[PDB]
Amino acid sequence: MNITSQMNKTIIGVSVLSVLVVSVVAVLVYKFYFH
């Protein structure tokens, strides 16, 4: 079980990139289909 001891900064970065990306897509379709 991860005890939130330490984490790589690089990991956080990519994580955010995937967050926005995914979100954007969901929105693009939401409008492109249900504008």
Residue by residue, DSSP assigns 1-35 as ---S----HHHHHHHHHHHHHHHHHHHHHHHHHH-
Q: How far is it, in rounded angstroms, from Cα 14 to Cα 1?
A: 22
Way it was determined: NMR
**Tokens encoding 35:** 């504008």
* Residue 3 CB-density burial (10 A; 0-12 exposed, 13-18 middle, 19+ buried): exposed
Tracing tokens 């690089």 back to the chain, one arrives at 10
Q: How far is it, in rounded angstroms, from Cα 12 to Cα 6?
A: 12
